[PDB]
Design a protein around this ligand. Structure first.
Ligand SMILES: CO[C@@H]1O[C@H](CO)[C@@H](O[C@@H]2O[C@H](CO)[C@@H](S[C@@H]3O[C@H](CO)[C@@H](O[C@@H]4O[C@H](CO)[C@@H](O)[C@H](O)[C@H]4O)[C@H](O)[C@H]3O)[C@H](O)[C@H]2O)[C@H](O)[C@H]1O
Ligand code: NAG
Ligand code: NA
Ligand code: NA
Length: 362
C-alpha cells in the first residue's frame, strides 16, 4: 500500500484529553503563562487509548462520532482519528501486577477476540473516518528481551496469535495500523535489533501482509529524542541512541525479511534532552522531561510517516505508592516524580513539568 495515512488530513484532538486538561489541570494552575500553555496543549492531537473494554462502546464511538460531525460540517482537510488498541490478556507481562483487566487463564483470548470484533464492527460503521491505530504497546517487544520472565514466556504465543488476529480483523480500507516496536533503548541495541526484526517481519508475513499494516510505532510512552547531535550519557554504549539511528538501522533488517515498515515516532515527552533519567531503562514518570515536537506528517524522513503524540503527557505511567497493589519498582526511584497515582490517571504535577520543559515552548 502506497500512501502515508497522515498525509492530507488534520489530526483530531480528542475531548477525553481536552477535558482532562480543562477540568483537572487548568483550574489547578495559578500562573498565567502556564495556563495559556495548558489550554494550547489541550488542542495538540494525541492518541486516544482503548485501555479498557468499556471504552469501546463509549469513548471510541464518541470520538468517531465527533470526528464525522466535524468533517460533515466542513473541516478542511478532514480530521482523522488516532486510536491505541491496548487490552491483551496478561497485559504488560514483565510487571509484577498489570493494570490489564483480562487473563489468559480466565478466558482472556475469547474476551480479546470479542474486543477486537466489536472494534471492527464500530470501525466498519465509521468507514468515512480515516482511522490510524497503534496496536498493543508494551507487548511483542517483551518477547525480544524478557523471555526469562515466566509471565512473558508464558504469554508469548498468545501475544502473537492475538496480534495476528487484530492485524487481520482490523485490516479495513480506511484503516492504517502500526505495531508497537519498543524504542531505541529497548530493541535498538545491536544484540536485540535483529531478533526484533525477525519477530516483527514474521508476524507481518503470518498475518498475510495485510494492506492496512503500514509499519511500526516507536518510543511509545518513552522519552527518546528523534535526533540529537550527541548521545545522552545514559545511552552509552548504544550507537542507536535516538529514534532516528534506531529506525535507520531497523528498517533494512525488516525489509530484507519482507516487511518494508514505515514508522511513527512518539515525541510527546521528548522535548527536553537529555532527560533526567539516571539510567535509560528508567521508564516511569521520568523527571526532567518536556512536551516535544508537535505531531506532523512533515518529518523530512523517507521511513517516517509522522511524528506523533501517542502517550498523552500528564497521564501517569504507574503509581509510586509502595503500599499499593500495582506498585512498580521503577515508579519508586529517585528519578521518578512522586507521589504518583495509578497508571493512566491524571498526574498534574507531571503535566506541569512537561509544560515547563516544552520544546518548542507553548
Ligand atoms: C531493555 O530496555 C528496557 O526494557 C524494559 C522492559 O524490560 C522497558 O520497560 C518497559 O518500558 C515501557 C516504556 O517504554 C513501559 S510502557 C508503560 O505502560 C503503558 C503502555 O505504554 C502506559 O500506561 C498507560 O497509558 C495509557 C495512556 O496514558 C493509559 O490509557 C493506560 O491506562 C495506562 O495503563 C505507561 O505510561 C507506560 O509507561 C513498561 O511499563 C516497561 O516495562 C524499557 O523501556 C527499556 O528501556
Ligand atoms: C466487552 O464490552 C462489550 C460491550 O462492548 C460487552 O458486551 C462485553 O461483555 C465486554 N466483555 C467482557 C468480558 O465483559
Ligand atoms: Na458533537
Ligand atoms: Na531470533
Amino acid at each position: 500500500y502506497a500512501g502515508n495515512p497522515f498525509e492530507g488530513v488534520q489530526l483530531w484532538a480528542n475531548n477525553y484529553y481536552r477535558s482532562e486538561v480543562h477540568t483537572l489541570a487548568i483550574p489547578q494552575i495559578t500562573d498565567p503563562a502556564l495556563r495559556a500553555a495548558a489550554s494550547a496543549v489541550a488542542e495538540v492531537p494525541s492518541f486516544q487509548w482503548l485501555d479498557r473494554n468499556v471504552t469501546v462502546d463509549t469513548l471510541l464511538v464518541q470520538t468517531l462520532s465527533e470526528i464525522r460531525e466535524a468533517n460533515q460540517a466542513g473541516a478542511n482537510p478532514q480530521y482523522a482519528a488516532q486510536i491505541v488498541v491496548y487490552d491483551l490478556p496478561d497485559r504488560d507481562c514483565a510487571a509484577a501486577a498489570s493494570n490489564g483487566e483480562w487473563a489468559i487463564a480466565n478466558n482472556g483470548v475469547n474476551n480479546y477476540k470479542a474486543y477486537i470484533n466489536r472494534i471492527r464492527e464500530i470501525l466498519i460503521s465509521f468507514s468515512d473516518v480515516r482511522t490510524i491505530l497503534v496496536i498493543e504497546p508494551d507487548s511483542l517487544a517483551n518477547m525480544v528481551t524478557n523471555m526469562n520472565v515466566p509471565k512473558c514466556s508464558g504469554a508469548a504465543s498468545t501475544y502473537r496469535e492475538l496480534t495476528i488476529y487484530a492485524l487481520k480483523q482490523l485490516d479495513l480500507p480506511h484503516v492504517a495500523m502500526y505495531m508497537d516496536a519498543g524504542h531505541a533503548g529497548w530493541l535498538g541495541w545491536p544484540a536485540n535489533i535483529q531478533p526484533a526484526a525477525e519477530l516483527f517481519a514474521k508476524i507481518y508475513e503470518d498475518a498475510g501482509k495485510p494492506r492496512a499494516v503500514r509499519g511500526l510505532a516507536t518510543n511509545v510512552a518513552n522519552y527518546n529524542a528523534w535526533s540529537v547531535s550527541s548521545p545522552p550519557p545514559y545511552t552509552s554504549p548504544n550507537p542507536n541512541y535516538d529514534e532516528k539511528h534506531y529506525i535507520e538501522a531497523f528498517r533494512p533488517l525488516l525489509e530484507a525479511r519482507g516487511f518494508p515498515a514505515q514508522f511513527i515516532v512518539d515525541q510527546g515527552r521528548s522535548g527536553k534532552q537529555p532527560t533526567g533519567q539516571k539510567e535509560w531503562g528508567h521508564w516511569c514518570n521520568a523527571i526532567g522531561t518536556g512536551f516535544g515536537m508537535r505531531p506532523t506528517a512533515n518529518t523530512g524522513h523517507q521511513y517516517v510517516d509522522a511524528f506523533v503524540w501517542v502517550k498523552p503527557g500528564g497521564e501517569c505511567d504507574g503509581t509510586s505508592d509502595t503500599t499499593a497493589a500495582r506498585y512498580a519498582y521503577h515508579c519508586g526511584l529517585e528519578d521518578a516524580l512522586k507521589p504518583a497515582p495509578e497508571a493512566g490517571q491524571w498526574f498534574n504535577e507531571y503535566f506541569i513539568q512537561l509544560l515547563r520543559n516544552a520544546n518548542p515552548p507553548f
